[PDB]
PDB file of C-alpha atoms and ligand atoms in Angstrom:
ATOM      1  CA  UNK A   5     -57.623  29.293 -40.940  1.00  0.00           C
ATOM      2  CA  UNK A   6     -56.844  26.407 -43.098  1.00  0.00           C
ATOM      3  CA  UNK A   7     -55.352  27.396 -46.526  1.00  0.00           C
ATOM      4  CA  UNK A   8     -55.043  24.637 -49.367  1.00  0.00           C
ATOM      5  CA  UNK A   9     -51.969  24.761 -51.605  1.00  0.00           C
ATOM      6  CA  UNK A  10     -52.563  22.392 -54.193  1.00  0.00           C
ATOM      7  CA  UNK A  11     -55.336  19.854 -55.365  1.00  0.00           C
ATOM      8  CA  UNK A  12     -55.272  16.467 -57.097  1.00  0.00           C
ATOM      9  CA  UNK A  13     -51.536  16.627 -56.983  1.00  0.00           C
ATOM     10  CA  UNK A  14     -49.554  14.016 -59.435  1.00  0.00           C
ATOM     11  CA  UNK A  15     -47.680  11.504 -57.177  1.00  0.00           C
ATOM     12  CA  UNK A  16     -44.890  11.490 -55.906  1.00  0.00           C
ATOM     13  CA  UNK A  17     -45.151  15.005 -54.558  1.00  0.00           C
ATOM     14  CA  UNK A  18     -42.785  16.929 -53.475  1.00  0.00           C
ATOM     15  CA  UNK A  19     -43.378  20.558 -52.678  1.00  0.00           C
ATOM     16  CA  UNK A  20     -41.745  23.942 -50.422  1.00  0.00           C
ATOM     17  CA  UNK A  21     -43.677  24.368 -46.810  1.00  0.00           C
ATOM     18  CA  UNK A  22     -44.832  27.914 -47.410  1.00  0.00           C
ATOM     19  CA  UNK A  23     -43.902  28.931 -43.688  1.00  0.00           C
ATOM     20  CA  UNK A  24     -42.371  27.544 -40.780  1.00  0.00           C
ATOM     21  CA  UNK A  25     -43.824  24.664 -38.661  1.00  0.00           C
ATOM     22  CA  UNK A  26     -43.893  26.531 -35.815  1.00  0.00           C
ATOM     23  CA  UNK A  27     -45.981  24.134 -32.513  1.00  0.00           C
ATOM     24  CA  UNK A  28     -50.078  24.820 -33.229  1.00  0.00           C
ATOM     25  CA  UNK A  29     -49.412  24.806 -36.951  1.00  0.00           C
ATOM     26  CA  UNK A  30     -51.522  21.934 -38.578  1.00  0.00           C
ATOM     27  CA  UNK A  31     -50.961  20.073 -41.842  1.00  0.00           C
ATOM     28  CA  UNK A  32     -53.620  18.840 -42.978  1.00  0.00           C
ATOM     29  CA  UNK A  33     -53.707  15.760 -45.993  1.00  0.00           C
ATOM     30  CA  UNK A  34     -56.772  14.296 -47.587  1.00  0.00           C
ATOM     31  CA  UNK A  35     -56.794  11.414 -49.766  1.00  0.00           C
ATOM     32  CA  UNK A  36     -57.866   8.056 -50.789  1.00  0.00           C
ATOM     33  CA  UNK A  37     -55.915   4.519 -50.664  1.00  0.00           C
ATOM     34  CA  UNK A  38     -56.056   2.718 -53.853  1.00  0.00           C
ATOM     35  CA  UNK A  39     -57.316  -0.912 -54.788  1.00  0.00           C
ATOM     36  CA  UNK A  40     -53.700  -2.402 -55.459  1.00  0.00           C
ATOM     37  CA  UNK A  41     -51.776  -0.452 -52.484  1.00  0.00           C
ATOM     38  CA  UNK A  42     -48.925  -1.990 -50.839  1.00  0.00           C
ATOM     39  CA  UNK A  43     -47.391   1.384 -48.893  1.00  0.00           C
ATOM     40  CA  UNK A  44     -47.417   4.827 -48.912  1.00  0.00           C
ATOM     41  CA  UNK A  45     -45.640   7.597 -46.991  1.00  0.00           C
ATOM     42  CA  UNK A  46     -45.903  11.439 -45.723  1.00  0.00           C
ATOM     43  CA  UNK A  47     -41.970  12.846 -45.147  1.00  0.00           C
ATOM     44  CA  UNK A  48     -41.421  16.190 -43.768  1.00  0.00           C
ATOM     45  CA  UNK A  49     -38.041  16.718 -45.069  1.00  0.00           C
ATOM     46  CA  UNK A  50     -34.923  19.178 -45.063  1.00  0.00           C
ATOM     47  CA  UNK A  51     -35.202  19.956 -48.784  1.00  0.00           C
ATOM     48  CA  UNK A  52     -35.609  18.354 -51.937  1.00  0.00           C
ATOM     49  CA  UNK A  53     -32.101  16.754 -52.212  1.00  0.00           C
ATOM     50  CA  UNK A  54     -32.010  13.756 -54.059  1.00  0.00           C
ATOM     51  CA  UNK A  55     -28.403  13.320 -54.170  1.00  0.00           C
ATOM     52  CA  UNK A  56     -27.771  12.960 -51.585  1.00  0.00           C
ATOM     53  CA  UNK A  57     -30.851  12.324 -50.080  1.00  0.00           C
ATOM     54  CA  UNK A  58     -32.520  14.981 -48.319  1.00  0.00           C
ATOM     55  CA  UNK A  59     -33.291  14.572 -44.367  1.00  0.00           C
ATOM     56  CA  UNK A  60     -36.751  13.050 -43.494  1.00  0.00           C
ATOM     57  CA  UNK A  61     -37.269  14.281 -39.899  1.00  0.00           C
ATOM     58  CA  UNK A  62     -41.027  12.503 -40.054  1.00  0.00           C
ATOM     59  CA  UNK A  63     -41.668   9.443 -42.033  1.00  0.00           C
ATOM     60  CA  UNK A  64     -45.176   8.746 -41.942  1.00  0.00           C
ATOM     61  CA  UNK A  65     -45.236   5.601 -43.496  1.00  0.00           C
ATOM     62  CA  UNK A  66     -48.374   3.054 -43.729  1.00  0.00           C
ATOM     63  CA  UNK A  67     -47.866  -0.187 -45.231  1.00  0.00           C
ATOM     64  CA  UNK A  68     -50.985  -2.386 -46.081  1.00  0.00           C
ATOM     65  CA  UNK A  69     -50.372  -6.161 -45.019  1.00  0.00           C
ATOM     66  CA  UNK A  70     -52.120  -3.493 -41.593  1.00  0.00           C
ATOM     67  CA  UNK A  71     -49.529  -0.498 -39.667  1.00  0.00           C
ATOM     68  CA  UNK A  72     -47.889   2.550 -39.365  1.00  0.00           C
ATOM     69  CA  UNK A  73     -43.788   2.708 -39.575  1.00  0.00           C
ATOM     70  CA  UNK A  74     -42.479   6.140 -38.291  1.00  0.00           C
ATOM     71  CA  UNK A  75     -38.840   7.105 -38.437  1.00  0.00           C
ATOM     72  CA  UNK A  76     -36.013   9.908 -39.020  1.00  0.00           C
ATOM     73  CA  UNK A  77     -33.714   9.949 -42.073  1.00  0.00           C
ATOM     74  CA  UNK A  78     -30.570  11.257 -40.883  1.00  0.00           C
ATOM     75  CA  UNK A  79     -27.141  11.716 -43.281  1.00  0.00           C
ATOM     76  CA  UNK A  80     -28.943   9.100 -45.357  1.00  0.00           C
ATOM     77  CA  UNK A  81     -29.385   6.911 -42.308  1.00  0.00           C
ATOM     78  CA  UNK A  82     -32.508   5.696 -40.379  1.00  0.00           C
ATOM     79  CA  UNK A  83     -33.168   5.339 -37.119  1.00  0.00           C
ATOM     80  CA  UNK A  84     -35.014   3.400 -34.741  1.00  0.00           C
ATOM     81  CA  UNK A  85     -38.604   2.341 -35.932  1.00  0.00           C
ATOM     82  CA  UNK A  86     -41.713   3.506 -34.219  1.00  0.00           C
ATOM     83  CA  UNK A  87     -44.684   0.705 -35.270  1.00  0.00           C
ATOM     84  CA  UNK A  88     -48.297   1.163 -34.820  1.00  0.00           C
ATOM     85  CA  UNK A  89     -50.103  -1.637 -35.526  1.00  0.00           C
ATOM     86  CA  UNK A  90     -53.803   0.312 -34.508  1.00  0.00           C
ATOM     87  CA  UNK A  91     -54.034   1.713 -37.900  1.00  0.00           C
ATOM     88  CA  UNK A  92     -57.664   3.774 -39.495  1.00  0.00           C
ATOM     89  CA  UNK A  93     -56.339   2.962 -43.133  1.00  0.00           C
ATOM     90  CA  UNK A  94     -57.632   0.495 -45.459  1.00  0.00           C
ATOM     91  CA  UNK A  95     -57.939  -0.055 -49.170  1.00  0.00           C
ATOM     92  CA  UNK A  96     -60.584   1.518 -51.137  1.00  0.00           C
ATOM     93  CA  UNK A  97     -61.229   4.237 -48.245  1.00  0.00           C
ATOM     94  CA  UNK A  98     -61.050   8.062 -47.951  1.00  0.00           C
ATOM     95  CA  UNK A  99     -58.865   9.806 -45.564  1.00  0.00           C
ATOM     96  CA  UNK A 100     -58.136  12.989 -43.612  1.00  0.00           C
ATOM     97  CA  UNK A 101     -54.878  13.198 -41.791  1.00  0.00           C
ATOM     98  CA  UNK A 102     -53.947  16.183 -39.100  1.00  0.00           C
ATOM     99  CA  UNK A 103     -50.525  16.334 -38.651  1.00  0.00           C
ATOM    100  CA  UNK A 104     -50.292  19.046 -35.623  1.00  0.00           C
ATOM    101  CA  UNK A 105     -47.293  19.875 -34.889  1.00  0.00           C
ATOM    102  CA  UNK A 106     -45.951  20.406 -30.960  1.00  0.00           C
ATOM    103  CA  UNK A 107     -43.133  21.925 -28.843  1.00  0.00           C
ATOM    104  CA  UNK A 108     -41.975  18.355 -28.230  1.00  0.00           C
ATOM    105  CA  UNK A 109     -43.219  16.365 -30.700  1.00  0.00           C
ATOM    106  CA  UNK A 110     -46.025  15.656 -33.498  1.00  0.00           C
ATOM    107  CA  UNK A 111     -49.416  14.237 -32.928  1.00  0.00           C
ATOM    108  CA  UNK A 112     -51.119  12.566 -35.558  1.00  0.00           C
ATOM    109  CA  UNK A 113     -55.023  11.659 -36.375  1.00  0.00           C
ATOM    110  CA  UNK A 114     -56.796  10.671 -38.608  1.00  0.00           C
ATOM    111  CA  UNK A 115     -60.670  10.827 -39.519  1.00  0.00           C
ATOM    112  CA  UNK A 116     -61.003  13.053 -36.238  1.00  0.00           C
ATOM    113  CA  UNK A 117     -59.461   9.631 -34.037  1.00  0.00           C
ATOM    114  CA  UNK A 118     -56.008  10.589 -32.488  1.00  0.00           C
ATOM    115  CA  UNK A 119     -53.624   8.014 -33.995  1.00  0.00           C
ATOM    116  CA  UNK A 120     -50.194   8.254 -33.179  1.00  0.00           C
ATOM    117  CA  UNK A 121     -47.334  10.566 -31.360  1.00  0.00           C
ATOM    118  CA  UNK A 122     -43.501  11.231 -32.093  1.00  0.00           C
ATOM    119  CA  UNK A 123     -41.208  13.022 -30.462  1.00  0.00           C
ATOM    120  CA  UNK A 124     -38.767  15.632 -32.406  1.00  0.00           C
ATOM    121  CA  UNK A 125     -35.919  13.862 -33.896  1.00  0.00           C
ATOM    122  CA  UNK A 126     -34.634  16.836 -35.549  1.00  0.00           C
ATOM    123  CA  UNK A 127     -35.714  20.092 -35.094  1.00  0.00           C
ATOM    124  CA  UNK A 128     -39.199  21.084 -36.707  1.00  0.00           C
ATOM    125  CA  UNK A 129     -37.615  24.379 -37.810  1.00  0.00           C
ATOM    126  CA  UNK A 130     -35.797  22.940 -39.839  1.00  0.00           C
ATOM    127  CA  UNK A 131     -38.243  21.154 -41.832  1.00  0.00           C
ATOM    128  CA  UNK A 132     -39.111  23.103 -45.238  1.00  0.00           C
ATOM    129  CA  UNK A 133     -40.307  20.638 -47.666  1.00  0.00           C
ATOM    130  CA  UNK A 134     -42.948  17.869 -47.730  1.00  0.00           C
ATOM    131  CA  UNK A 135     -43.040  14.582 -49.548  1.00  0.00           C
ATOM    132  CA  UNK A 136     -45.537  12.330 -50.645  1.00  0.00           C
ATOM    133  CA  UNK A 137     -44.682   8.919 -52.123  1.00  0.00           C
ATOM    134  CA  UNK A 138     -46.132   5.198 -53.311  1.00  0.00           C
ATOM    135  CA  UNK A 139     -49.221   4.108 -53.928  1.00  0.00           C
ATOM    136  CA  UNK A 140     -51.744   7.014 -52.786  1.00  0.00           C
ATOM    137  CA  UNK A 141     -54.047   9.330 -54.354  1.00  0.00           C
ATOM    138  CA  UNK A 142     -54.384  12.988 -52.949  1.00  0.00           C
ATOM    139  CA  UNK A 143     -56.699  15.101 -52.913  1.00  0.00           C
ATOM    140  CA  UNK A 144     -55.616  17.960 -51.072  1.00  0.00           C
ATOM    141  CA  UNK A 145     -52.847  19.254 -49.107  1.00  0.00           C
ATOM    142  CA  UNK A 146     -53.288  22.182 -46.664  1.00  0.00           C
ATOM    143  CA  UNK A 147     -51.641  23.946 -43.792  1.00  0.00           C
ATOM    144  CA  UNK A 148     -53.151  25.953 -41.168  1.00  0.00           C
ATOM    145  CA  UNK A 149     -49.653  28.131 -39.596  1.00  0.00           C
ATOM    146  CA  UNK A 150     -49.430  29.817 -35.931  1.00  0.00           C
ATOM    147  CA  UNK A 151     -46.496  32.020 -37.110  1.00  0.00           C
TER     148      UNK A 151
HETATM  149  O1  LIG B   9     -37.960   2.637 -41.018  1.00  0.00           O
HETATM  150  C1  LIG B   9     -38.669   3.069 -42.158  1.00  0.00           C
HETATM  151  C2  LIG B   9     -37.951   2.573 -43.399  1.00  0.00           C
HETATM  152  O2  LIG B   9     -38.098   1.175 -43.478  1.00  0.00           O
HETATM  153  C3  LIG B   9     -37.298   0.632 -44.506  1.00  0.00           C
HETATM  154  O3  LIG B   9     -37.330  -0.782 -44.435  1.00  0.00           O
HETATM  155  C4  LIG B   9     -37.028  -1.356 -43.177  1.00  0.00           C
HETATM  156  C5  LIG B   9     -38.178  -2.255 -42.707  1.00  0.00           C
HETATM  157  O4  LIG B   9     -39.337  -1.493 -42.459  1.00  0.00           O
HETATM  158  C6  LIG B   9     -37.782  -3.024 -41.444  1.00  0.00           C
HETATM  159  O5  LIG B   9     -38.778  -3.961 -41.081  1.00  0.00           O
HETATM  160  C7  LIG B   9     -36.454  -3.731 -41.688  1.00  0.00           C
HETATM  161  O6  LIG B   9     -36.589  -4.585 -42.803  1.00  0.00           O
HETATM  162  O7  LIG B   9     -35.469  -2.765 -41.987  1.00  0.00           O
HETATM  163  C8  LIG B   9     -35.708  -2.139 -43.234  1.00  0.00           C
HETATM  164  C9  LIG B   9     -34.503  -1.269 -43.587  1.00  0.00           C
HETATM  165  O8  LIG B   9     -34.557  -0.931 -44.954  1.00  0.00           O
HETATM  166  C10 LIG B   9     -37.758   1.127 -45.874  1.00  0.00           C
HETATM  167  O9  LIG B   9     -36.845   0.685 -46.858  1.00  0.00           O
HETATM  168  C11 LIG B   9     -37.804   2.650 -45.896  1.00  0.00           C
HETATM  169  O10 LIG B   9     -38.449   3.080 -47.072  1.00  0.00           O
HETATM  170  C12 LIG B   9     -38.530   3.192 -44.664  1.00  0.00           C
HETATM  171  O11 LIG B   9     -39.910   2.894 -44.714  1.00  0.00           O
END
């Protein structure tokens, strides 16, 4: 049930959500960390607003030095930090992340090992566009919905 929307895509992304994240719906992002890395990040957003900048309700941001920073950008604010300092990603490696999202919350893994979990900020419905940014090569980017 997995449909792919785009391949290779030129980073930074940024591209419409098809259909709503509704709980069961999946995103699913495959990739590949480069040599000279220093962060990347996933951002399920409330549009593509630049000016001013768009509401991140999930920042999914890794940061190679290694961890996971999650947060919510709110009226061009952020909010309290959510580390994880367990983190699958490394330099020169593949990757598959599952975002799933929940009723409650999102619930992260990658390479088929659960990850991480964070609890709705803002509402999922209101997320329409997703965001990929830094140093990151992707090679896919698919959704699986339960609309
Ligand atoms: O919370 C995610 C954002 O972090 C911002 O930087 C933080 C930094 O992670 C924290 O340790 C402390 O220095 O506060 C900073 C506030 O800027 C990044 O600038 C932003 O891109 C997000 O990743």
């Amino acid at each position: 049930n997995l449909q792919n929307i785009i391949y290779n895509p030129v980073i930074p992304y940024v591209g419409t959500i098809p259909d709503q994240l509704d709980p069961g719906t999946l995103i699913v992002i495959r990739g590949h960390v480069p040599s000279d890395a220093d962060r990347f990040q996933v951002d399920l957003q409330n549009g593509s607003s630049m000016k001013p900048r768009a509401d991140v309700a999930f920042h999914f941001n890794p940061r190679f030095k290694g961890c996971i920073v999650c947060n919510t950008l709110i009226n061009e604010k952020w909010g309290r930090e959510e580390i994880t300092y367990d983190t699958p990603f490394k330099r020169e490696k593949s990757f598959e992340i599952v975002i799933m999202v929940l009723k409650d919350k999102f619930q992260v893994a990658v390479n088929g090992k659960h990850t991480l979990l964070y609890g709705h900020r803002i509402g999922p419905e209101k997320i329409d566009t997703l965001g990929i940014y830094g140093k990151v090569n992707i090679h896919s980017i698919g959704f699986s919905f339960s609309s």
